[PDB]
Design a protein around this ligand. Structure first.
Ligand code: ADP
Ligand code: ADP
Ligand code: ADP
Ligand code: ADP
Ligand code: ADP
Lengths: 370, 370, 370, 370, 370
């Protein structure tokens, strides 16, 4: 069988070919002990990875090896891959071909080094590099549609029509769930709650995950929040302290719609999708208007679909029918398509093998993968 | 039975001998993918033809194998014939005679290679090539008249009398529906609408089909258009943008009457018809004055008959009676006449059979066809 | 005297009649503050225009009011004109005639509104709208030639012969320096350099102007660039980081020769030039084959003339003599030739006066200018 | 001295009396610009005539003032005479007698208005119009012969014996070099080269002048041209494109001998000559059989004399001696012969002087000339 | 006139507008008796404040109501403002507008309650709250630069450029002089010097003020301290005991560069500044590299400027010209900028009026202040 290992910015999701649920979903963390070990009989390990690092975070310093989808340090990243293959899959890569995902429009050295690490360090029999939006489109059981995929680090619109993607219409924006978490950290100081280290960064991430939702409108929702207490909710910290939050419940995800909140110049995801489809040819825009496919955890907020449909309808011409595909299982959808892709017979000749590698050099991946 | 398959410049119209309507009418286009395919499956083809190519046209490049009645790309034309016989009519030509149509004054290699392809690639038992406008007149049940046939690529006047075609009088002008469409594409930029590549050319062709007409008097029509908005009309694109066109409706067809709009020196359709008549002998001119038979979709613009009647009447002698035959089904006359002409018993000896072809080479069609 | 003011897509170039070089050459930018001001002073303005906008770009959003030769933002364009007249040239327009240039086949409402603003907001004594390529041909001191004028937004070919333009042979393509800049941004992410903001677009534009060149051949040059680092050059960002670029030096302008790179379908500028020369009557092609006139900033790449001469010669017949006119000062050509228009006496009857405007409405610009 | 100004259908040949060559030999065309002029600083004229119009033809529409030996555009013809006198011969008209030429059986108003505008617009002291073929005979230095003269617009046979021309046997046919060129244009489309404008008509005339000849036997030459490529020849357009033409080299001339090619009911020029002899009395026929003299550029085709030998010999009685008189300079005959006649003393009693015109009106040329 | 009142974490500085030396500067201390008072007299007061409390610290317990810039105990700090208004400045609140300062990213209730108390308990005519870093930059007489302001409780980097702040680039750390003095306690225990109660906190603060300096590089300085007796210095305690300190001279402020010394995870102030500018736009970073402004008492150490510059040159790229602006009077820099703002004419329109408060509640001071 085959392995699908989505190395997202925040969460690594891994599984075998054909399965409907991932055998692995864990944060992409490398943790190192920031204080001095004093217990010899118990001892310590130089670095902790995955959920193991995620439980004892009170002592560790946490590093994301993936930042905005670009691999920044390869050492901790290969440690994360070693975890995935050995500890959690308990599998030997040498007898299983590996499928990897990646955000569109990324530096070539990135995929270069992933190929080199897979084939030399891990010696995979074959390996492929694919685009996350295409895999999400596969997961939707469709062939025509525009994928708006926003993970932890990257958001991107990729429109595909009758299976032909349009690279000139691909739009990429480096503003995603991690930057939302950072904005939540910056704004939670408004009510006197201070979080400065990565460990409490994870608390703020959990807060955004459990409490935040996307309002249908901004200004009237601001008025309602400033006029009543019905919108304030309470959350219990790991120490037992209780924090009540109000408008910042929805001001965090709305950064996806007004990047100006975090000082970015580009427009929101609605406007980015609109431009990414306007760059498309006339005859297909219709089919794209009714096939807005969403993927990644950043679009799991309650009511995001209704807000974004309202926005597009406002910018769209009145006659058109805008229909948004928001599957309940979309935060695994990018992974899910990989499971289908690895199970497709007509893809079995698309793997990049060791044989072609050793003759074509590392630059092979760019004349066999889009 | 027999097959009648008008390979017009823009639309292929095909059917069986004897019917009152062609079984399949579809645009003569060949589309090839212009982008890179990312969905791996079993539905993508190297090239798409016919209406199926017309529907996905946003993502294909469209080539017309027929230009000004001259067949330019033989491979694609062969593909279009394969589509017509095997998919639309679902017939095996090897057991059916075929009637083909051709514009007058054409390169001899064109019909020689048509004959070669029919006799070798498709193994047609016998095939005839007929002048299109002669067939259109046979449709109207006459033996006398001047046929002014304007298809998509070529316009031509042939005056005939008692079944005797007069070779010294045929007038051929390479100014027809495609050039009108291109002129509309050039002049639509006046109102800010841009249509640059092959996909939207079909859209402009559709606007020309649904909204254009020929003015009775051009200058007063400009006065009306620049004085009020009663002639401005709105059309919706596939993407919902609503375009308003004013004079643009009638400036496109008048290119048939003032070729100088597109830079052509040859005179208009009316004067071309008048010259095609005045090149004839005198004692028959009268019968041609009252039997102006029009055909081809380029002649379905509302008011073409009345305007061209005014023009010829102006050029004609005063005591002469000018009458024009404008069948509501004229854009199919070229086909329907063939359905008649292929059914006449007096034809059954006019077919060019295989046996004579194998002994006379490609040159036989020159000494057995007008 | 008379004022000539080329409103190019990227750079506005202005001066008085007779001078051999534009007095004011500055980019066409309106910049607005994207951040909230905290130092309460008297120097902060709602919008900055020209070089003063260029310098402060790190804190402003830059908009071009001109896109692809069609003006989309009217008010900021009025502001840019306010800069040109009052600050750069320091001139009162009320008593100097103004010469304005425009790309061919532009929406008629565009020059309609330019004329309206000139005759109402600035009340110019008179103004003429000339076609840019004609003025550039003036600069060459000729009367016959095919001008390929490519600025920041528009690439257009005009053939003229003994000074008569052939309107049916005009060719226009909305792909120019701006689109090359955008492509350069899209492909600089290949090496890990990310440029997303409007100010950073300007930096990529400077990169393009400094380190890009046109390759004589493309495949062999790719082989060379992938074989050695001799083509890789270094450049410093305004913040001092050093970037090394290899093949991306010559992949950026090759879009002018393979628009399929950027997703457009229309052919490259060499094939567009060939089609433009082909649409003309036969007896003149020879003269145009040896009078290929280049203008605009888009054609200052080293070696563009040699490559495009190679291309035309490959398409052109063997006997024909291909000669290219690439003056060193061609960037200002459209300007300097206009200076001749204003200084040539037999033209002071071609101005559109206020007096005839007040009676003929804003439509007068149409029947006195090509 | 006197002026000989042969106003042929296509080529005007003018000069002084007594010279052996015409000083001015230029095409009789008027060209008008068919496009809009944009070069304000170049010396455009309303119309170009003569070789200057010949050069700029690629941008001009060409009108021939003379069709079939009859001036249809009189204003253009006065323009052509103005160029002849003031620009080519650079001679003051009022102080020089002028000798004009005319084909027989030409409508009387033609010569009437010729004389009128010579005596009123140009104030010529005296002129003379003569039958062109009579002057052609005078060139040959004979008093006997049947002159066949075929110019650009008219072919005609006149028999003259001892200086007595016999009007009742004079034959005229309106089939000449112009219709030859038109038929050449019609038949060049068989190989796929299309010439439609007046400019390309001139190119086709040049191909006619360079590559056509008269075949001794038609069907033998058809067999030779259909069996081998020995007869094909290649010609180069002003653009550098190359045509290859085979049998069309000898089909274009022979419509002289088989007018049914272009649909004329009249017999060939050989049969017309034989009829012109046969309508003559018996006693003189022999002298005309051996004295068939040719003139006019339409008779410059190689092999015309031998072919006329063969055909007339086939028609004429066997015991009669037949002889072609084809001087190498016969295409100047109509001019040079006049130079002799205008210098003969016996002429200066036969000029139509101004004085007798002022009393006899335009009709004087009728009773003082043949 | 207007009052400028900086409530720093450790030192309160209050004065009038326009002055150059603070009329009042004193520790923000509230002291309460900790023992039983046995003498019956008129001098024993419930609670002591400011300098006079700093004198009686022996029998007092001291409380800072400002901890990390956020106000905790409102009653004692209200007493503090009362003492500043009445005993220090000897003025009445009701007839003098007041300007207050606040660290960036500070909770909502802090400044709402500050404005509340000012406008109701003290009845100030008008109040304003501004950002300390901005006023410190005002002190430098500049309009562009990144301020690093480190007081007793809060350090923060705020980059601004031509009066426009970049809120996404503001960096705040709760590590300042108070934490430094606590660290100095924690490390003085090695040499047997013990300081536990709040009274000796002032002693150790005086020690830190009088003795510590920033080493150019930490490690060679540590080797020097462990190798020789050149550096240790003697301080005279209030009780007469003398202490000699060595490496603890430069270990105390090194915490600002390596917060891991006090268990914090964040990077040092050098890396904090470099990141804070890296968040800003590219086109501006160079300007900020030359305009590093240090302010507050925490950057008064000898040698801090050289070490900070050295570190930044290590992190910053090579060519950059890095300049640190360290005015000798920076301890009051944050104050004096207010003395400008309160006196600046353009600012007299920015105050929050009592009239506007009585309608908008506490929420007014937020939509008109940054
Ligand atoms: N219910 C939720 N609401 C809001 N955000 C969520 C939710 N679940 C996950 N996320 C965010 O989505 C981000 C991306 O996770 P995922 O969708 O797996 O893509 P990837 O891990 O590839 O970036 C996570 O960083 C997380 O913060
Ligand atoms: N209703 C209409 N009005 C105007 N033009 C039409 C109409 N219908 C068809 N046409 C044009 O006529 C052209 C030629 O079609 P047709 O008459 O069938 O001749 P052909 O044999 O070239 O297909 C088409 O390209 C189409 O653009
Ligand atoms: N030296 C150069 N090399 C390459 N490109 C250049 C150079 N100078 C200018 N350009 C490009 O040419 C574009 C247009 O230049 P210009 O001729 O001023 O056109 P416009 O008339 O639109 O102002 C600019 O956007 C710039 O990117
Ligand atoms: N060498 C030649 N071969 C074939 N045709 C010729 C040649 N020279 C001239 N002609 C044709 O003869 C025509 C008539 O020329 P010419 O004999 O001078 O009579 P005209 O007096 O009508 O000009 C010209 O139009 C030209 O096309
Ligand atoms: N010469 C000095 N050297 C080192 N630290 C100092 C010096 N002077 C003052 N400090 C420290 O600076 C801190 C902040 O004082 P100040 O600059 O007034 O800011 P604020 O009072 O606004 O917090 C004080 O707690 C003090 O410990």
């Amino acid at each position: 069988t085959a392995l699908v290992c989505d190395n997202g910015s925040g969460l690594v999701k891994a599984g075998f070919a054909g399965d409907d649920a991932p055998r692995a979903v864990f944060p992409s963390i490398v943790g190192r002990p920031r204080h001095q070990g004093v217990m010899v009989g118990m001892g310590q390990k130089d670095s902790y990875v995955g959920d193991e690092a995620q439980s004892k975070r009170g002592i560790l310093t946490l590093k994301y090896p993936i930042e905005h989808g670009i691999i920044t340090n390869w050492d901790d990243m290969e440690k994360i891959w070693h975890h995935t293959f050995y500890n959690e899959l308990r599998v030997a890569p040498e007898e299983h071909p590996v499928l990897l995902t990646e955000a569109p429009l990324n530096p070539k050295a990135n995929r270069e080094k992933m190929t080199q690490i897979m084939f030399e360090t891990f010696n995979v029999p074959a390996m492929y590099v694919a685009i996350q939006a295409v895999l999400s489109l596969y997961a939707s059981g469709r062939t025509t549609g525009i994928v708006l995929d926003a993970g932890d680090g990257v958001t991107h619109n990729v429109p595909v029509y009758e299976g032909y993607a349009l690279p000139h219409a691909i739009m990429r924006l480096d503003l995603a769930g991690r930057d939302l978490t950072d904005y939540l950290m910056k704004i939670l100081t408004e009510r006197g709650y201070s979080f400065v280290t990565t460990a409490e960064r994870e608390i703020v991430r959990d807060i955004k995950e459990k409490l935040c939702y996307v309002a249908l409108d901004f200004e009237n929702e601001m008025a309602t929040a400033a006029s009543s207490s019905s919108l304030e909710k309470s959350y219990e910290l790991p120490d037992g302290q209780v924090i009540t939050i109000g408008n910042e419940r929805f001001r965090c995800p709305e950064t996806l719609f007004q990047p100006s909140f975090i000082g970015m110049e580009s427009a929101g995801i609605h406007e980015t999708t609109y431009n990414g489809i306007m760059k498309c040819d006339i005859d297909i825009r219709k089919d794209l208007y009714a096939n807005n496919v969403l993927s990644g955890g950043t679009t799991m907020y309650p009511g995001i679909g209704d807000r974004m449909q309202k926005e597009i309808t406002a910018l769209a011409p009145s006659t058109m029918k805008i229909k948004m595909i928001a599957p309940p299982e979309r935060k695994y959808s990018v992974w899910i398509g990989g499971s289908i892709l690895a199970s497709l017979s007509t893809f079995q000749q698309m793997w990049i093998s060791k044989d072609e590698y050793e003759e074509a050099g590392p630059s092979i991946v760019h004349r066999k993968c889009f």
